Amino acid sequence: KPYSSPPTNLRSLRDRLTQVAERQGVVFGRLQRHVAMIVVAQFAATLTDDTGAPLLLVKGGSSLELRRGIPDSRTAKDFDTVARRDIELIHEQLADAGETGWEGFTAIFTAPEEIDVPGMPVKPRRFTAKLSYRGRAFATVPIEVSSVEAGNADQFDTLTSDALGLVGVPAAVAVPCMTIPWQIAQKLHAVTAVLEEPKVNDRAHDLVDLQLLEGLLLDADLMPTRSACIAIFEARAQHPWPPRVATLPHWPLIYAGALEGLDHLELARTVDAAAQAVQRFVARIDRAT
């Protein structure tokens, strides 16, 4: 019933994902995108410095998928990462790892391109991973790599998934990830940012993520989160801490879109309630000692 050998080619892999997907109550494509992401994370996890410490920490939506699992998180399309060390050293090393491969997967990495960001001295970089399993093209994963900011790579959590184990690839998955305090600080800053009138802030989906991250903090002391918030808000020197969680007029339907698939969770059902929930969380953070 559980496969004893790894899949022999792509068709058998896709075929096994679909069977796991239906068996688990999940949409096939979501499961496949999640496996693609895990595979990319395993390439990133082999990148270490000369002490063995990870060079890349995953953040953003890919990280929330690994923390809460597929049923209890938004679909993540970006593989957001933070590089402890710099520039094309990260790209050349991922092309290296991708050529060597992992349990039959290989990957090619398109060329990096800078992106416009006001509060980042080093402009983050986007490119793409072209995955293949035993030769045959498998999937494509967008990747975003940003540079360290303050202490947001000082520590890391290590997260697992057994999705690959369900299709007969038994190797252990262990992905270094940015800690929750710094994930809260960066989402809080992005959801409250005012952008230049050429573009407008569409990030109502971060009101969902901030409610999920608050849930994951449990009863923990908030001083680490407050220090991370102060650090990121000062580092970036845009709006000051503590921010006001404003909603924009087009956010109601964007927020409703971000809640697809999460009816079973304890979430604000309207973007107003969500903004109120996140503002109380901001006050909670500001009060800690």
Q: Is 256 in the site for Mg ion (CB under 5 A)?
A: yes
Per CB under 5 A, the segment of 43-51, 90-98, 109-117, 194-202 that binds Mg ion is 109-117
AA identity, residue 84: R
Whether 259 has a binding-site annotation, put simply, is: yes
Per CB under 5 A, the segment of 40-48, 99-107, 138-146, 147-155 that binds Mg ion is 147-155
Q: Is 79 in the site for Mg ion (CB under 5 A)?
A: no
CB atoms within 10 A of CB 38: 21
Per CB under 5 A, the segment of 96-104, 114-122, 194-202, 260-268 that binds Mg ion is 260-268
Helices and strands of the chain, counted as H and E runs = 10, 8
Give SS3 for 3: coil
Backbone φ and ψ for 263, nearest 5 degrees, come out as -60, -30
Whether 88 has a binding-site annotation, put simply, is: no
Q: Is 30 in the site for Mg ion (CB under 5 A)?
A: no
Question: For 74-109, b where at least 16 C-beta lie within 10 A, e where not — what string?
Answer: bebeebbbbbbeeeeebbebbbebbeebbebbbbeb
Sole binder of Mg ion in the list 108, 122, 148, 150 (CB under 5 A): 150
Q: How many residues bind Mg ion (CB under 5 A)?
A: 57
Sole binder of Mg ion in the list 6, 7, 20, 146 (CB under 5 A): 20
CB atoms within 10 A of CB 127: 16
Residues with their C more than 2.5 Å from the N of the next written residue in the chain, i.e. before a break, are none
Location of structure tokens 């410490």 = 53
State the Cα–Cα distance between residues 99 and 283, nearest whole angstrom. 48
Whether 213 has a binding-site annotation, put simply, is: no
The residue of the chain with the least Cβ separation from Mg ion equals: 257
Burial of 260 per CB tally in 10 Å (0-12, 13-18, 19+) = exposed
> Which residue ranges make up the site for Mg ion (CB under 5 A)?
9-11, 16, 18-22, 28, 59-61, 63-65, 73-74, 76, 85-86, 89, 110-111, 127, 136, 150-151, 155-156, 160, 172-173, 177-178, 183, 186-187, 190, 221-224, 227, 231, 254, 256-260, 273, 276, 280-281, 284, 288
Residue positions in the annotated binding site?
3, 26, 61, 63, 74, 78, 80, 86, 110-111, 118, 136, 144, 157, 162, 178, 187, 202-203, 205, 214, 218, 221-223, 236, 244, 246, 254, 256, 258-260, 262-263, 265-267, 269, 276
